[PDB]
Amino acid sequence: EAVKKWVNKIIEENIIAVFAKTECPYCIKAISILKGYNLNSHMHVENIEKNPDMANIQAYLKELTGKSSVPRIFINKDVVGGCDDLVKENDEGKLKERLQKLGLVN
Ligand SMILES: [Co+2]
Ligand SMILES: [Co+2]
Ligand SMILES: [Co+2]
Numbered sequence: 001e002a003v004k005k006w007v008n009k010i011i012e013e014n015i016i017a018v019f020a021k022t023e024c025p026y027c028i029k030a031i032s033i034l035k036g037y038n039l040n041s042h043m044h045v046e047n048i049e050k051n052p053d054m055a056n057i058q059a060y061l062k063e064l065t066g067k068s069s070v071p072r073i074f075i076n077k078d079v080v081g082g083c084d085d086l087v088k089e090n091d092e093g094k095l096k097e098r099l100q101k102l103g104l105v106n
């Protein structure tokens with residue numbers, strides 16, 4: 001329960017929550033895309049590789065999202081998914097819609 005509670009706190013206390021690992025090009029790409037919307041003040045990036053319970057975190061992220069890979073991206077507790085999902089939402093206007101409803105972009 002401790003691992004799940006810790007992950008939950010990250011998702012619930014940050015509007016934009018990104019789970020990442022070290023030297024992860026698609027993590028870096030997704031984080032850069034989000035910071036390009038000036039979301040930094042409401043983002044937390046968690047490096048789950050620098051963590052003794054990486055496998056537990058990944059298993060829980062799969063239970064929540066369908067995949068154990070990083071990056072894993074949540075926006076106001078809603079599952080965006082990975083960087084490819086973020087790129088699809090960004091290119092098709094869904095990302096902007098999301099952020100507008102949250103007051104994060106005009
Ligand atoms: Co290397
Ligand atoms: Co900027
Ligand atoms: Co952290």
